[PDB]
Scaffold this active site. Structure first.
Site, PDB file in Angstrom:
ATOM      1  N   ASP A 103       0.838  -1.030   0.020  1.00  0.00           N
ATOM      2  CA  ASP A 103      -0.129  -0.001  -0.037  1.00  0.00           C
ATOM      3  C   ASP A 103       0.855   1.260  -0.060  1.00  0.00           C
ATOM      4  O   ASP A 103       1.899   1.193  -0.655  1.00  0.00           O
ATOM      5  CB  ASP A 103      -0.760  -0.215   1.307  1.00  0.00           C
ATOM      6  CG  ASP A 103      -2.029   0.762   1.080  1.00  0.00           C
ATOM      7  OD1 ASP A 103      -2.373   1.836   0.949  1.00  0.00           O
ATOM      8  OD2 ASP A 103      -3.314   0.024   1.065  1.00  0.00           O
ATOM      9  N   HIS A 107      -3.748   5.914   3.981  1.00  0.00           N
ATOM     10  CA  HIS A 107      -4.556   4.868   3.466  1.00  0.00           C
ATOM     11  C   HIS A 107      -3.962   3.425   3.903  1.00  0.00           C
ATOM     12  O   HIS A 107      -4.483   2.763   4.485  1.00  0.00           O
ATOM     13  CB  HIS A 107      -4.588   4.802   1.978  1.00  0.00           C
ATOM     14  CG  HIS A 107      -5.423   3.813   1.257  1.00  0.00           C
ATOM     15  ND1 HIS A 107      -4.897   2.598   0.889  1.00  0.00           N
ATOM     16  CD2 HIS A 107      -6.588   3.676   1.080  1.00  0.00           C
ATOM     17  CE1 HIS A 107      -5.846   1.757   0.534  1.00  0.00           C
ATOM     18  NE2 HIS A 107      -6.982   2.350   0.524  1.00  0.00           N
ATOM     19  N   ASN A 119     -14.210  -0.283  -5.949  1.00  0.00           N
ATOM     20  CA  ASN A 119     -15.383   0.577  -5.592  1.00  0.00           C
ATOM     21  C   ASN A 119     -16.043   1.190  -6.626  1.00  0.00           C
ATOM     22  O   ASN A 119     -16.519   2.345  -6.367  1.00  0.00           O
ATOM     23  CB  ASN A 119     -14.777   1.796  -4.556  1.00  0.00           C
ATOM     24  CG  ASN A 119     -14.071   1.111  -3.443  1.00  0.00           C
ATOM     25  OD1 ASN A 119     -14.280   0.159  -3.019  1.00  0.00           O
ATOM     26  ND2 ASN A 119     -12.891   1.871  -3.164  1.00  0.00           N
ATOM     27  N   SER A 155     -11.181  -1.245   0.209  1.00  0.00           N
ATOM     28  CA  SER A 155      -9.921  -1.181   0.952  1.00  0.00           C
ATOM     29  C   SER A 155     -10.002  -1.598   2.454  1.00  0.00           C
ATOM     30  O   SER A 155      -8.970  -1.823   2.956  1.00  0.00           O
ATOM     31  CB  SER A 155      -9.235   0.288   0.623  1.00  0.00           C
ATOM     32  OG  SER A 155      -8.885   0.383  -0.586  1.00  0.00           O
TER      33      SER A 155
END
Ligand SMILES: c1c[nH]c(-c2ccc3c(c2)OCCO3)c1
Length: 279
Positions: A39, A69, A161, A224
């Site tokens: 990530d 994130h 998403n 996520s």
């Protein structure tokens, strides 16, 4: 063990019903397992990680998480308050820049890094990789995820998403990894969650409180956020000796809460991650 006033998603993964707020889990808590968070990095100094987080690789000028994130996802895997597997070791691989973006070639390099790097780590109970990232379909990205899985790592990936079929996204569309959709606290499919035959499982993904950079916390939404619930659950179950990296996705689906989610389209599994812990 019981954690009172837990984030709703932790309470949900140990419950046969929505609407409770205590997380129940075996105190082994993923001790002896390891989870790679591929990530934007992890703020390892956050007190919530208790020294159990470390950066192992970056492709950019820093290994620090300048976005948040990756720190949030890592907190859902294994932070003391916000994590599923509260004693796992967390390894950060920064394939995304501080704006959350990364080239597929870097993401592929990061997955092959983890497949080798696990041989440099002590993870006697097993190894998991959490990939809260993706983009459009790429056979090369899917192949890299399949290699990582084949090497003996339980790979959990975000479905995406786009409120669309995940068949057109990667690594979501790779059959051999665990593709994770998102649900909300009322057991509805999250409004943004991708769906389709390639999904293996759903996890909590709407309004998920976790760690953030600057030693802070915040609540955000996405597939996520559901992915690290499943990754942490895999590490927890592997520590308990209930499953292996090769079989953990299938085991999670077999032991999931079944048929309890609303707004799941025909042909998508109606399975919500569940630890089956009997306190
Ligand atoms: C039964 C009643 N309505 C649905 C349905 C239909 C299409 C859908 C959907 C859910 O979720 C999102 C994708 O498109 C099944």
């Amino acid at each position: 063990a019981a954690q009172t006033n837990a984030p709703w998603g932790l309470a949900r993964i140990s419950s046969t019903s929505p609407g409770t707020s205590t997380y129940y889990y075996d105190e082994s808590a993923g001790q002896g397992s390891c989870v790679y968070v591929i990530d934007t990095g992890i703020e390892a100094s956050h007190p919530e990680f208790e020294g159990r987080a470390q950066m192992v690789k970056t492709y950019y000028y820093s290994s620090r998480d300048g976005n948040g994130h990756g720190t949030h996802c890592a907190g859902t895997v294994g932070s003391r308050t916000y994590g599923v597997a509260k004693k796992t070791q967390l390894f950060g691989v920064k394939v995304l820049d501080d704006n959350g973006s990364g080239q597929y070639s870097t993401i592929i390099a990061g997955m092959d890094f983890v497949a080798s790097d696990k041989n440099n780590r002590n993870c006697p109970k097993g190894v998991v990789a959490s990939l809260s990232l993706g983009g459009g379909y790429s056979s090369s990205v899917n192949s890299a995820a399949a290699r990582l899985q084949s090497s003996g790592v339980m790979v959990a990936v975000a479905a995406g998403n786009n409120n669309a079929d995940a068949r057109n996204y990667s690594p979501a569309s790779e059959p051999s990894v665990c593709t994770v959709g998102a649900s909300d606290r009322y057991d509805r499919r999250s409004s943004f969650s991708n769906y389709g035959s390639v999904l293996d499982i759903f996890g909590p993904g709407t309004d998920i409180l976790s760690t953030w950079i600057g030693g802070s916390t915040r609540s955000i939404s996405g597939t996520s956020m559901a992915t690290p619930h499943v990754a942490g659950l895999a590490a927890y179950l592997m520590t308990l000796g209930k499953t292996t990296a090769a079989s953990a996705c299938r085991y999670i689906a077999d032991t999931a809460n079944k048929g309890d989610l609303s707004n799941i389209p025909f042909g998508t599994v109606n399975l919500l991650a569940y630890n089956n812990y009997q306190a």
